[PDB]
Design a binder for these strands. Structure first.
Ligand SMILES: NC(=O)CC[C@H](N)C(=O)NS(=O)(=O)OC[C@H]1O[C@@H](n2cnc3c(N)ncnc32)[C@H](O)[C@@H]1O
Length: 529
RNA sequence: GGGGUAUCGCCAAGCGGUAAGGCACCGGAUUCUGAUUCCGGCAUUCCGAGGUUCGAAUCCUCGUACCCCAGCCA
């Protein structure tokens, strides 16, 4: 339960409503991010819990900013998250003829007029945060004049910016939004839904409330920056002949540490090619998190955990990581893979190889076991072997022995370095029957795997606050390593995450993994202290 | 100027009856993943200062910090 649900409950109780109807109204001007998922879980989540409906409306009132590629990705992400919308996908465009008629009503009611104030002039007349604005010299045109002018506008008789339809409210209002807000503006641009049928388009504030009313929304849930806007929202509905009046409620938006959360900034990363694309695994986008290896479930849990309030907030990366770790820890089958390989040949080994038993999950034997090949020539992580120090160091020491995961106990006795001093191979000896722990991969039965290690996209906790957020990008956000994995991963498919032993959770796809060279994204490493 | 928010490192319950929970952090027990699990600990005070009441994070007063609004964007 949260404050929004309490209002809903109170309404149901008081009999103000008998059903709940919400909506998720994104603008198709970019892809969705973890922030939009908060909105998605709030709106769709509420609807299904109260046995109600929730629409997926595309607020497409600004053609020049929107694109068809975006509507498709938004639809994909919502479905991927596991939510279904009521009826067909709605579009603000669907109400264009309707909005137009309503504007005409306002005009006949003397509550809207066509303004000739240039785009610069309108601001000059608008006033400031401390000084009231002033009435336009065109504000008193007759109803007939405005009617003609609006049609002139619609008919495309005016050039872009040469005129606009504004609401006649109060230029001396403390709410800057109520100072004769523009209802319509001229844009001779093709619309992705209505083609070139329109040259004038409705503004967000005029559109949004009427869209909600027509769809019969009971609770329009948006973020805090629209609190001022509610005044206009209510003004519009209170001044037109519309049978319902949905109520707007605002909750604080999500902010994630080390990443930016605005389509504007995210779009810049894509446009400047600083990331592969919107779906890049470093991106805080849904598709990006998806390609990164995050489960829709883990994301819904995150939204559940972060809550819904009116307090500004910035969630730490550790919270999101905990969610995906919880899920994957419980479901992802374990395996063997080496990021920094160094050959470790057991000189004590006779033959070509054998096959050992390994649980698909150590704490869950019901998940089964597999048969992984063992040999005299294996691969191990360079971070596992050390000729020196600390009693705490549980891994392979130059004078000690270490248990190989689900296998025998080796014991390094001789190492082989090179000209720069780098070790090429570690000669060891295995115990006949012995079945610190370390993972490994048989050199003979080894699958050439490309491993991509991701990290925080930005060097600072609040990159959005940087003067040039781009200059603070982490150069090590992506570190492509080449390693070896057990032959099992040969049959690994994109979509499933395997937990590489002692390294983290990984998954195929990467948008690069082929048949010869499989690419694996590190969804997230394991907890290490 | 108007609109909002102040509770642990980060989130968040709380709605006159005596500070939940999560993430995180500090200990101890297990583990063939330094993982998992696992028991034990972690705000005598809620932005500050007065006031009210038997009792206040909750009510009252004055202050303070931060966030949003001057697109023909959403
Ligand atoms: N009344 C409204 O919600 C405005 C609708 C507008 N088309 C709009 O905001 N479009 S949008 O594409 O920008 O986003 C759609 C929804 O997502 C919410 N949102 C956007 N960023 C968010 C964030 N960081 N955290 C939480 N919610 C966030 C918007 O409020 C909107 O409901």
């Amino acid at each position: 339960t949260n404050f929004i649900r309490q209002i809903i409950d109170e309404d149901l109780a008081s009999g103000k409503h008998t059903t709940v109807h919400t909506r998720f109204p994104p603008e198709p001007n970019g892809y969705l991010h973890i922030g939009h998922a908060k909105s998605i879980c709030l709106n769709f989540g509420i609807a299904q819990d109260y046995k109600g409906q929730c629409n997926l409306r595309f607020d497409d009132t600004n053609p020049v900013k929107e694109d068809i590629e975006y509507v498709e990705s938004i639809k994909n992400d919502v479905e991927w998250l596991g939510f279904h919308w009521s009826g067909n996908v709605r579009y603000s465009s669907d109400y264009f003829d309707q909005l137009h008629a309503y504007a005409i009503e306002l005009i006949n009611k003397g509550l809207a007029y066509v303004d000739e104030l240039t785009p610069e002039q309108i601001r000059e007349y608008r006033g400031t945060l401390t000084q009231p604005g002033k009435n336009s010299p065109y504000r008193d045109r007759s109803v007939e004049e405005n009617l003609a002018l609006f049609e002139k506008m619609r008919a495309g008789g005016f050039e872009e910016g040469k005129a606009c339809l504004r609401a006649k409210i109060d230029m001396a209002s403390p709410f800057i939004v109520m100072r004769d807000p523009v209802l319509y503006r001229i844009k001779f641009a093709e619309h992705h839904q209505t083609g070139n049928k329109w040259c004038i388009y409705p503004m967000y504030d005029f559109t949004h409330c009427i869209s909600d009313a027509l769809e019969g929304i009971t609770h329009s849930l948006c973020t805090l920056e629209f609190q001022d806007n509610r005044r206009l929202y209510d003004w519009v509905l209170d001044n037109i002949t519309i049978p319902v009046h949905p109520r707007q409620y605002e909750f604080s938006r999500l902010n994630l540490e080390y990443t930016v959360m605005s389509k504007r900034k995210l779009n810049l990363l894509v446009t400047d090619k600083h990331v592969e694309g919107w779906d890049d695994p470093r991106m805080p986008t849904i598709s990006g998190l998806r390609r990164r290896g995050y489960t829709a479930a883990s994301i819904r849990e995150f939204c559940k955990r972060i809550g819904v309030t009116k307090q500004d907030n910035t969630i730490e990366m550790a919270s999101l990581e905990s969610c995906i770790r919880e899920d994957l820890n419980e479901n992802a089958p374990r395996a063997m893979a080496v990021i920094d390989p160094v050959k470790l040949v057991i000189e004590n080994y006779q033959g070509e190889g054998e096959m050992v038993t390994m649980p698909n999950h150590p704490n869950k034997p019901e998940m089964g076991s597999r048969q992984v090949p063992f040999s005299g020539e294996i691969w191990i992580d360079r971070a596992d072997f050390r000729e020196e120090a600390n009693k705490q160091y549980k891994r392979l020491v130059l004078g000690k022995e270490v248990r190989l995961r689900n296998a025998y106990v080796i014991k390094a006795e001789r190492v082989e370095k090179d000209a720069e001093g780098n070790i090429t191979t570690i000669f060891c000896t295995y115990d006949a029957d012995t079945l610190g722990v370390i993972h490994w991969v048989s050199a003979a039965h080894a699958l050439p795997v490309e491993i991509r290690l991701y990290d925080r996209l930005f060097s600072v906790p609040n990159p959005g606050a940087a003067d040039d957020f781009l200059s603070v990008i982490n150069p090590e956000s992506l570190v492509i390593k080449q390693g070896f994995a057990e032959p099992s991963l040969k049959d690994a498919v994109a979509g499933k995450a395997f937990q590489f032993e002692r390294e983290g959770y990984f998954c195929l796809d990467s948008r690069h993994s082929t048949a010869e060279k499989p690419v694996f994204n590190r969804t997230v490493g394991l907890r290490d202290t």
